[PDB]
Amino acid sequence: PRYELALILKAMQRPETAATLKRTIEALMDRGAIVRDLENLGERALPYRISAHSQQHNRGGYFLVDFYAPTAAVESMVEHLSRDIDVIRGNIVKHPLTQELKECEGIVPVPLAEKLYSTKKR
Amino acid sequence: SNEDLPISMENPYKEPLKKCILCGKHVDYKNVQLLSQFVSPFTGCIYGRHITGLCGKKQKEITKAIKRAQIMGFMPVTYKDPAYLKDPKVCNIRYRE
Amino acid sequence: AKHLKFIARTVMVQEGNVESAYRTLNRILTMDGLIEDIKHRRYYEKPCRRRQRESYERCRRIYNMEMARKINFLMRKNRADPWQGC
Amino acid sequence: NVESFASMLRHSPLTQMGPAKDKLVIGRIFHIVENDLYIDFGGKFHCVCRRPEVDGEKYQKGTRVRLRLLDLELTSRFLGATTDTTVLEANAVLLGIQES
Amino acid sequence: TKFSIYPPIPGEESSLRWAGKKFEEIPIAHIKASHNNTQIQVVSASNEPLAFASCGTEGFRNAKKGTGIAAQTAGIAAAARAKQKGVIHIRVVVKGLGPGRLSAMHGLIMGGLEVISITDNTPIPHXGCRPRKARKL
Amino acid sequence: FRDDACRKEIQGFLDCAARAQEARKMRSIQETLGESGSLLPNKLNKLLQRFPNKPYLS
RNA sequence: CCCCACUAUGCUUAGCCCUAAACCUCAACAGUUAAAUCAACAAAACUGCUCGCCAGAACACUACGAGCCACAGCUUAAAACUCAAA
Numbered sequence: 001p002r003y004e005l006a007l008i009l010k011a012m013q014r015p016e017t018a019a020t021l022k023r024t025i026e027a028l029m030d031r032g033a034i035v036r037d038l039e040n041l042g043e044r045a046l047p048y049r050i051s052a053h054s055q056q057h058n059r060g061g062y063f064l065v066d067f068y069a070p071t072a073a074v075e076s077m078v079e080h081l082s083r084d085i086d087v088i089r090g091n092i093v094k095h096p097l098t099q100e101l102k103e104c105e106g107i108v109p110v111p112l113a114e115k116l117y118s119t120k121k122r
Numbered sequence: 123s124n125e126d127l128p129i130s131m132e133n134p135y136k137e138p139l140k141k142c143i144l145c146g147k148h149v150d151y152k153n154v155q156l157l158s159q160f161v162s163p164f165t166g167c168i169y170g171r172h173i174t175g176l177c178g179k180k181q182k183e184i185t186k187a188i189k190r191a192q193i194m195g196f197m198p199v200t201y202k203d204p205a206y207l208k209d210p211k212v213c214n215i216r217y218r219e
Numbered sequence: 220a221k222h223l224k225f226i227a228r229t230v231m232v233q234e235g236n237v238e239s240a241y242r243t244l245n246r247i248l249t250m251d252g253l254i255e256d257i258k259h260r261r262y263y264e265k266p267c268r269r270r271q272r273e274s275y276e277r278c279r280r281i282y283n284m285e286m287a288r289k290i291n292f293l294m295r296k297n298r299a300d301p302w303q304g305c
Numbered sequence: 306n307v308e309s310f311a312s313m314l315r316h317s318p319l320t321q322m323g324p325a326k327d328k329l330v331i332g333r334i335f336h337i338v339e340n341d342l343y344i345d346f347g348g349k350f351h352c353v354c355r356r357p358e359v360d361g362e363k364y365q366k367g368t369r370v371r372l373r374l375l376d377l378e379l380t381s382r383f384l385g386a387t388t389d390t391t392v393l394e395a396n397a398v399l400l401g402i403q404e405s
Numbered sequence: 406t407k408f409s410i411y412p413p414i415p416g417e418e419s420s421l422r423w424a425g426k427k428f429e430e431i432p433i434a435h436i437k438a439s440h441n442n443t444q445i446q447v448v449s450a451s452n453e454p455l456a457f458a459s460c461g462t463e464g465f466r467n468a469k470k471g472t473g474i475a476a477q478t479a480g481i482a483a484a485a486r487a488k489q490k491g492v493i494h495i496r497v498v499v500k501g502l503g504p505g506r507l508s509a510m511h512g513l514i515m516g517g518l519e520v521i522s523i524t525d526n527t528p529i530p531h532x533g534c535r536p537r538k539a540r541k542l
Numbered sequence: 543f544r545d546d547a548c549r550k551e552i553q554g555f556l557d558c559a560a561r562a563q564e565a566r567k568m569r570s571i572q573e574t575l576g577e578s579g580s581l582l583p584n585k586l587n588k589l590l591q592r593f594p595n596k597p598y599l600s
Numbered sequence: 601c602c603c604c605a606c607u608a609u610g611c612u613u614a615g616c617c618c619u620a621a622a623c624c625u626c627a628a629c630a631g632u633u634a635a636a637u638c639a640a641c642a643a644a645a646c647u648g649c650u651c652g653c654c655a656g657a658a659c660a661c662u663a664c665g666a667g668c669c670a671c672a673g674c675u676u677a678a679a680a681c682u683c684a685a686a
């Protein structure tokens with residue numbers, strides 16, 4: 001299916017970041033994935049401190065990899081990212097653009113519930 | 123029979139159903155700016171739908187996106203990211219007297 | 220512990236008015252439910268007891284909001300008697 | 306050739322008005338209690354409007370005024386009630402006086 | 406400019422100053438308001454301890470420590486030792502809902518310190534350790 | 543414990559107690575009058591008597 | 601009952617045990633709101649069809665028999681004596 005890899009990389013110089021991305025995209029292809037696009041979301045301060053591979057991180061490079069892969073590649077890729085020392089945090093989710101949003105007519109009002117109690121005099 | 127008798131039909135004056143501010147829009151966990159508009163600035167607590175004004179479907183979408191974004195490294199948990207404090211105030215809550 | 224400090228639950232004092240800053244902070248923590256949450260967490264509330272409390276609190280909200288809605292609806296009728304003497 | 310009730314109802318101004326929310330109507334003050342003006346505007350129920358602060362003395366019994374209607378009858382069903390509670394008055398906003 | 410209750414964010418260029426010091430440079434008064442005691446420690450922005458006072462160190466014992474006046478006395482004592490070390494403005498970080506939560510802050514002010522901000526850091530577990538069983542009273 | 547040296551502080555405490563003594567006398571009057579209250583339970587119950595909730599059919 | 605300390609235990613894995621006010625004490629499916637609405641209370645009153653279950657209290661979540669990884673257990677489950685009530 002179509003997946004989205006949300007990849008937070010260690011803050012590095014341009015050469016080491018390109019080597020990490022190439023090494024990560026090749027890992028996807030080695031597992032049978034068809035990589036569709038690579039998006040750079042920019043280097044930013046993390047929302048909190050993240051400890052990864054005996055190091056503390058406060059900034060990271062946010063990248064996205066849109067790709068298709070067999071269902072068995074996800075588990076194998078997650079294991080690969082856990083060993084890459086230049087990856088702070090990597091998560092694979094089902095691509096949000098696959099889920100088609102159903103149409104909505106609006107808010108249907110809810111009337112106050114009726115006949116909850118008998119009408120006998122108490 | 124008679125021309126002036128009422129005729130059966132649907133209410134012509136019926137108003138269109140109201141929609142939430144996010145009706146028809148995609149809620150992504152990477153759009154931290156939008157998600158930040160539905161958490162407390164001081165505590166990061168997700169606002170209930172009585173504060174956000176969202177429909178049930180979008181209250182769930184926002185909630186699930188926030189929880190995903192927080193643990194994936196996109197959004198803080200204990201406070202609203204200060205970068206997003208000057209965004210439009212869409213929630214119905216006032217903390218200053 | 221891993222987050223930045225002096226952002227969460229932080230209120231700045233204006234013109235040395237520490238009372239108003241503390242009241243604002245207490246109002247913030249109260250509205251977000253933290254004060255009541257801290258109190259309920261001092262001793263363990265068993266799940267059966269928590270479910271009963273939530274049911275009681277939800278039924279109280281419905282009753283209180285419906286009584287308030289009726290009070291506001293009838294308040295206009297609190298005007299002086301237009302037909303006094305009849 | 307006697308007009309039927311169905312005909313009277315179809316061609317009545319109250320029928321032709323449609324929904325009452327945000328409709329401008331002409332009312333007449335028929336009863337006054339202190340600064341509460343009781344105004345009939347052609348509906349089942351009168352509305353009660355407070356005397357405006359400006360030109361309050363111009364509003365007297367018989368004075369015709371302009372109203373913006375909100376509801377012809379204020380009614381609501383409350384928790385546990387079997388029927389709707391009615392206050393037996395219309396909801397309207399007093400705009401001013403009508404003059405020629 | 407209008408007043409902002411939100412604290413200045415470190416790394417941005419704010420105009421607020423206190424004795425020529427930025428918000429990130431103001432010392433911190435850590436108040437631990439427990440149910441049976443109140444502890445106050447003033448530290449520098451670099452985490453250097455400057456003064457410590459608690460209801461117990463001010464000569465209160467047993468239930469008297471868990472009072473507002475006991476915390477107020479601890480605040481004055483901590484303020485006095487901190488003022489000698491050059492402290493005027495402090496950032497208050499209070500954790501706990503004890504009786505000396507607010508009184509400890511008053512004592513810091515009566516002792517000559519100016520509170521520029523108040524921070525709550527009461528630990529709230531998001532799901533955490535199981536607390537002790539309820540009391541039968 | 544010499545009152546001669548603590549005059550200003552004593553006069554403060556004395557005035558503060560007097561203000562709190564009068565304040566209770568003020569509050570009590572305004573509480574019964576309802577000057578600050580949204581409505582008095584007594585007044586708010588006479589209004590409900592006129593529009594009683596009807597959980598039964600008539 | 602209140603305070604402190606600490607164990608079995610609450611967790612995981614692999615097997616047992618098979619019990620709860622396991623109760624929303626309101627069976628499944630289909631249907632109705634009219635007639636008589638209806639002991640009381642509770643969560644208005646009923647029809648069709650089917651399975652399960654019940655027939656004074658207590659003895660009795662007991663005895664015996666039988667089955668079961670259960671061996672101070674579980675399930676099924678009586679009788680005698682006693683009472684005019686429960």
Ligand code: FES
Pocket residue numbers: 104105106107140141142144145146176177178179180
């Ligand atoms: S009202 Fe349409 S999605 Fe919310």
Ligand SMILES: [K+]
Pocket residue numbers: 623
């Ligand atoms: K039950």
Ligand SMILES: [Mg+2]
Pocket residue numbers: none
């Ligand atoms: Mg143990």
Ligand SMILES: [Mg+2]
Pocket residue numbers: none
């Ligand atoms: Mg676990």
Ligand SMILES: [Mg+2]
Pocket residue numbers: none
């Ligand atoms: Mg159960």
Ligand SMILES: [Mg+2]
Pocket residue numbers: 625
């Ligand atoms: Mg049963």
Ligand SMILES: [Mg+2]
Pocket residue numbers: 627628651
């Ligand atoms: Mg069955």
Ligand SMILES: [Mg+2]
Pocket residue numbers: 657
């Ligand atoms: Mg029997």
Ligand SMILES: [Mg+2]
Pocket residue numbers: 661
């Ligand atoms: Mg048993």
Ligand SMILES: [Mg+2]
Pocket residue numbers: none
């Ligand atoms: Mg047995």
Ligand SMILES: [Mg+2]
Pocket residue numbers: none
């Ligand atoms: Mg046996």
